[PDB]
Amino acid sequence: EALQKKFNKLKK
Amino acid sequence: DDEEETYRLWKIRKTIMQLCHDRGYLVTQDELDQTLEEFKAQFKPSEGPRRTDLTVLVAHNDDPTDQMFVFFPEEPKVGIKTIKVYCQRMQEENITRALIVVQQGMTPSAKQSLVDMAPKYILEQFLQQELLINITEHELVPEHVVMTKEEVTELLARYKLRENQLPRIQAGDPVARYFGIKRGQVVKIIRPSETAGRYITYRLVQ
Amino acid sequence: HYCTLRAELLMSLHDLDVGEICTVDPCHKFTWCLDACIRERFVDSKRARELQGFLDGVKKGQEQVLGDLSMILCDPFAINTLALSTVRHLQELVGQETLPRDSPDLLLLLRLLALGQGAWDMIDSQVFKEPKMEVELITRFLPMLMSFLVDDYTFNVDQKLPAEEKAPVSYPNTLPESFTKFLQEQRMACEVGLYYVLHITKQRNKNALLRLLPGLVETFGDLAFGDIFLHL
Amino acid sequence: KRITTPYMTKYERARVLGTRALQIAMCAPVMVELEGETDPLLIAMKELKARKIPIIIRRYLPDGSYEDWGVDELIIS
Description:
This is part of a larger assembly, with chains A, B, C and D.
Chain A: H1 2-11
Chain B: H1 2-22, H2 29-32, H3 36-42, E1 56-59, E2 67-71, E3 77-78, H4 80-93, E4 97-102, E5 105-106, H5 108-116, E6 122-127, H6 128-131, E7 143-146, H7 149-159, E8 168-169, H8 174-179, E9 186-193, E10 197-205
Chain D: H1 10-25, H2 40-50, E1 56-60, E2 66-70
PDB class: transcription/dna/rna
Keywords: Nucleic acids, transcription, RNA polymerase II, nelf, dsif, pausing, TRANSCRIPTION-DNA-RNA complex
Entry title: Structure of paused transcription complex Pol II-DSIF-NELF - tilted
């Protein structure tokens, strides 16, 4: 869950 | 003509064996030395073998996981259904390298199919006519040797160059097709020289 | 080191093309793939499938070869190959948004590396059963590596985006210590973490480097203090 | 470890002699004892044979880098 939030944070 | 058909097919097989032997594939000595009457003995052709039966599968000496098919088509122009049959057989045997002869030409839609399906299935069209002779044995062609990436980087570091600066060899020319090298490969060419004895050059594929 | 010589001997016999030994050694077909991977220092998916088939081809009553395979997999260059393949798989999976549990090729790499690392256990006692994996390696350790990597890339994308005000926030240099617990409790997680450390050292990012440099001080089996990772 | 040849090319000879002759024509100090000479060309040739010209050649290698050479270091032929 932390890593997916980190992904969507890289997308932004 | 039936006699000239078997003569043509025997020279076709001989050139193919010499080709993939030059590519490093596992070729036995007998097929490299297979004669016309021996070619008859292992199997008259017209209305008697087949272009599907003549097809061969060869293994790579460096990597037994890699194999290469050489196919021949029973039709004048290779149709998309034949390409489908060949690539599906490759899928069943888990192979990606396949060579396909053409009697006199290829359907343009099959050319588009070849270039489209290239990364998943590497296919190369090849004229029967150009395959009738091993062009590498000519006097004018010098000796060609495909280089590998460690050789490329050590050469580049030895001369402090880039790939842009090297002389080019067009990838569509028949010698590169004989070796099957792709873009980004580089071929070391040794030739005789009437003022230094031997000369080595390096041609970047494009 | 002796195990490496064993594989070399077999390949030398393969270089001699002795069917009397090539056709009887079932690990000969395995070492096709091992040679083709160790020369590349990378296990592509094709040779991975081949290795999977060779493992699946081992029948009951002839499982001693698994020990030989583990011995053949105890070669340190093969550990380098498998560890770098795992690290590069985890590096490229961030772009595709795929977790380590969602990577069957990576799971096969973990299986093969686990079978390789227990080799001396399989020779010491004739163990012909597979070693087991760690859930937290799949769900905590490798996603923590991904966590560090993708924080680093988000910081990098922010740097490449202009309009940063005075006194910017540094990259988070705090270390989650369950990561270090897995380093100092699982030789598998330990060695793959060591090769990750070497890979980021090639990337030479000081922030993550000094973030994870604590916790490497205590590691499993002194593998962070062994010859391989120290030399690299 | 200067990889280039230790010889002076004829073009380097031409440029160094011309430049040093012009320097002597501009009332430069002469790093060799002349013997009643007046032409800067002859004085520059005398200095070249003496290997006493303060110029440093900078050969630009094709990769952007370069080598530096003292004239006395090169082989005058």
